Structure 1
Amino acid sequence: WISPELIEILLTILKAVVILLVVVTCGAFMSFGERRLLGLFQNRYGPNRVGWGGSLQLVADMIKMFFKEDWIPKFSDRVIFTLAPMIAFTSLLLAFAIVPVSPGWVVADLNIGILFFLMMAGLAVYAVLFAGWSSNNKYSLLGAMRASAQTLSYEVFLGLSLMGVVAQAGSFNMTDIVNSQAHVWNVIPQFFGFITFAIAGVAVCHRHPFDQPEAEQELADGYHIEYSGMKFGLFFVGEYIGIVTISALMVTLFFGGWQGPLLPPFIWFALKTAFFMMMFILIRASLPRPRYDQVMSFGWKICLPLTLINLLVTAAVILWQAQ
């Protein structure tokens, strides 16, 4: 059992497992960091008593949600009700599975890449629809229908916002996208692609200001309202893991990935990802929530034509300098 190929196989498997564990723990501790950073933005402290600086607050929440009574509604459909948090977790986890965090540290160097991310985004909207329908609550069903229509209105241009970066790289591969940003990061030429991808990534993660269970609380039409215990925890941790995945994808597609002058490449990747995670928190703290029809009209009438025009202009520029 002593061979360099076999040793490299377990090394790659161990690296993938390390990436998976770090991403899951980063999502949970970013739920905690969401509480602390909202406290920082609102002239307060947030949770700072359970452990040193509140660092054990996440463990207390996990214990509480594990030992909360497991509940499935009797009139609910058990399989779909159980299945929806699983998809809400795993979809954006497997979307992270393509992100190169360092040279040589990648789980899957796929030839499709952000195509795999788009596959995972479609499965995420399935998670929301299943959670709404399976609860046997007509209010949750209506709220999930509105949330899903919003998600479709922004997923309709998510990939098109990425197509300018793809066109500049000439490839779907994520490492080639990083290597094409060796001189100038993609946020300078694909600026409109960057802003449309940021808006669409916030929207497909159901983050503020696209969070349906927090948008309409008087109607009591949230699609989370029948979930409890560890299934609601799966929804929460999957949402935060989705924020981490969207931040890492934005870093690797528009901010050079791990590339940087002085620091080690993983340090640069982690710093840029943490900055975009913190910008997610600041977006939640600062901006108000637009109306539902306004949000969907903004997605259809502004962002999608902007992505199409950005792709056409990017192609014209690429063919113009192709002497």
Structure 2
Amino acid sequence: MLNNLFDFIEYIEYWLIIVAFVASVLIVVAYLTVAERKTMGYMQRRLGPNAVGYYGVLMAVADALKLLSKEIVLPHNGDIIYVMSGPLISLFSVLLSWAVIPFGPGLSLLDSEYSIIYLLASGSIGVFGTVIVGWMSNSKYTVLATVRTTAQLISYELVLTTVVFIIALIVSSLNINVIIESQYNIWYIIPFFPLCLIFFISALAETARPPFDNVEAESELVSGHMTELSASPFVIFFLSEYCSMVLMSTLTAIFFFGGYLPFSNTIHHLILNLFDQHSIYYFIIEGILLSGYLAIKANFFMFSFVWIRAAAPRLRYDLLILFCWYVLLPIVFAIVVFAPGILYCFDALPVII
């Protein structure tokens, strides 16, 4: 057979694309954990993991497989609901939030003019997943990291939501693809540099990364909510924190560094002229290039997640809630009344072309 097998592929083709998409995200997340220790290792004059697989390539494999084969500790044998439900919400939200990220023009699973709302809505479901982990527990350390966890995520959600809305206001579109294409002539890091610092600061808090680390602070509250997590509930929750790191690093690339747009249009043009547009080999190269530009921009921020962790001491929680309210929020509302003013003054109010 050859004719009754081709249509089989055409009936399964769009499932292979999704698996290639999910594998694409998980490979980045899996090797983000290694890159965090490999990078933070070399800034501390260490080496980091280089013994598990040649040069430590199989380090995420060992850590995941080690925990996937640990004894799950349930309060009573049939309490799998309590342990898993917390991390499961967190993992689904951040895996569903990947559905709007485009790897090129139009290459996103969900394309709709409400992509920005879908992205902020999905993240807020993950916030609900985080606080549930401790709220079903009697351990004092685990239940400690709910009231402080709840407000930290609540407080820096306003700042992250408003920043996204200012960029959406400059293009007058809540579509991810339109925002990226709107940055052809200029990258929004040049006009809105302060928002990028505010976006990156807020992004750290939302993922509970240091220096906004007070939730899962080893010296303060041990593993935080994870001091009661082991085996699979630990990995799923740990994976969620690194899906968010990859996502929020990609989102900073999209909103301020042009997304998949090339660093040089000339180099992009010269490279693609070596392939014929009438053969599928041209489109693989463009897709590799366009995701390559995003990957390099995204990698720089996954680097900065680790880089700031190796350079800044952890910030005290009481001084952390007052930072986003008494410093960041007035600035963010000041700009949201500033950008419409400048645009109107020069008759440059945006329209979705």
Aligned partner of 2:285 in structure 1 is none
Select which of 268, 286, 301 maps to 2:326.
301
Q: What whole-Å deviation, never above 9, does each CA across 1:204-236 have from its counterpart, x for those lacking one? A: 111112223543634547111110001101111
Select which of 301, 309, 312 maps to 1:287.
312
Aligned partner of 2:209 in structure 1 is 207
Matched, 1:180 2:182: yes
Q: What whole-Å deviation, never above 9, does each CA across 1:9-31 have from its counterpart, x for those lacking one? A: 86555433322221122112111
What is the CA distance between 1:309 and its match in structure 2?
1.0
- Over 3 Å counting, the alpha-carbon distance change for 1:294 and 1:109 in structure 2 is same
- Over 3 Å counting, the alpha-carbon distance change for 1:76 and 1:322 in structure 2 is farther
Q: Which moved more, 1:291-300 or 1:262-271?
A: 262-271
Residue type matched to 1:226 in 2?
E
Cα distance in 2 between the residues matched to 1:169 and 1:90: 30
Residue type matched to 1:290 in 2?
L
What is the CA distance between 1:301 and its match in structure 2?
0.8
Residue 49 of structure 1 aligns to a residue whose secondary structure is coil
- Over 3 Å counting, the alpha-carbon distance change for 1:103 and 1:82 in structure 2 is same
Q: 2:188, 2:257 within 8 Å by CA — same for their partners in 1? A: yes
Select which of 142, 149, 152 maps to 1:150.
152
Select which of 221, 225, 228 maps to 1:226.
228
Q: What whole-Å deviation, never above 9, does each CA across 1:26-65 have from its counterpart, x for those lacking one? A: 1121111111111111111101011111111111112211
Residue type matched to 1:305 in 2?
P
Residue 212 of structure 2 aligns to a residue whose secondary structure is coil
Aligned partner of 1:196 in structure 2 is 198
Q: 2:145, 2:216 within 8 Å by CA — same for their partners in 1? A: no
Select which of 241, 250, 253 maps to 1:251.
253
Aligned partner of 1:273 in structure 2 is 298
Number of aligned positions between the proteins: 321
Aligned partner of 1:47 in structure 2 is 49
Matched, 1:30 2:55: no
Cα distance in 1 between the residues matched to 2:10 and 2:306: 39
- Over 3 Å counting, the alpha-carbon distance change for 1:221 and 1:144 in structure 2 is farther
Give every structure 1 segment of 4 or more consecutive aligned residues whose post-TM-superposition deviation is greater than 6 Å.
6-9
What is the CA distance between 1:321 and its match in structure 2?
2.2
Residue type matched to 1:203 in 2?
A
Identity %: 33
TM-score computed with the length of structure 2 as normaliser: 0.85
Q: Which moved more, 1:215-224 or 1:82-91?
A: 215-224
- Over 3 Å counting, the alpha-carbon distance change for 1:32 and 1:240 in structure 2 is same
Q: Which moved more, 1:248-257 or 1:112-121?
A: 112-121
Unaligned runs of 5+ in 1: none
Aligned partner of 2:124 in structure 1 is 122
TM-score computed with the length of structure 1 as normaliser: 0.92
Aligned partner of 1:139 in structure 2 is 141
Residue type matched to 1:298 in 2?
F
Aligned partner of 2:283 in structure 1 is none
Q: 1:77, 1:134 within 8 Å by CA — same for their partners in 2? A: no
Cα distance in 2 between the residues matched to 1:157 and 1:40: 33
Q: 2:216, 2:225 within 8 Å by CA — same for their partners in 1? A: no
Q: What whole-Å deviation, never above 9, does each CA across 1:226-283 have from its counterpart, x for those lacking one? A: 1000110111111111000001111111110111122422111110011110111101
Q: 1:32, 1:57 within 8 Å by CA — same for their partners in 2? A: yes
Unaligned runs of 5+ in 2: 269-288, 349-353
Select which of 295, 315, 318 maps to 2:340.
315
